[PDB]
Amino acid sequence: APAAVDWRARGAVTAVKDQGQCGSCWAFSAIGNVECQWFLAGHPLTNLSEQMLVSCDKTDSGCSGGLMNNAFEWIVQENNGAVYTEDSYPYASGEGISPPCTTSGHTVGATITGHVELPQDEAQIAAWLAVNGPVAVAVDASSWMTYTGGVMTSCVSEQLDHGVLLVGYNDSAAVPYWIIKNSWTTQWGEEGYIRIAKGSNQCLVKEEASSAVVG
């Protein structure tokens, strides 16, 4: 467990995306994770499709929400472990409506063999992230609407309602923090990112952590 780690420094993270008026946060979390795991598996950084999940993942509810864990299992058990590139399946749920699932005319950008659920302990999550890469986590984002920048030292931690990507941490700073990639455009937060205090379960960050396994 290093003092600090930022996967962005290793070019293992893609640019911040926009989910629009669609509650597809879970999809962006799951995909953001796969993209990073794919890269770390010795493959070029490739933008994958969230739309594939929103439109085709029938074990979740597209714009009405879903679970990263269900998304992972769907990819493996229903789509032969394939994840299409974003180029082949562009995002079109910005207006809040998801177009029907299209079974063809897409290219596979990545493949996963399964997923692991991380223990509900920030220290353990950090140790894993430091070696294996970015992890998908659920948080309470009720107080995130007013986030403009800086390390959030106080976060409403009551109910999980948002999915995000954990890209790093810094234990050497005055206030140890987590580095989180959000999907609300670069206009929000620190260029699409947010930093929350680490070690006190801010926003319930340790409750639902998981990652896909490339294999």
UniProtKB/Swiss-Prot annotation:
Top-level taxon of origin: Eukaryota
S-S bridge residues: C22-C63, C56-C101, C155-C203
Note: Purified cruzipain is able to degrade itself, yielding a complex mixture of small peptides, and a major 25 kDa fragment.
Coiled-coil residues: none
Official protein name in the record: Cruzipain
Lineage: Eukaryota, Discoba, Euglenozoa, Kinetoplastea, Metakinetoplastina
Residues carrying covalently attached carbohydrate according to the record: N47, N170
Family named by the database record: Belongs to the peptidase C1 family.
Function per UniProt: Hydrolyzes chromogenic peptides at the carboxyl Arg or Lys; requires at least one more amino acid, preferably Arg, Phe, Val or Leu, between the terminal Arg or Lys and the amino-blocking group.
Catalytic site positions: C25, H162, N182
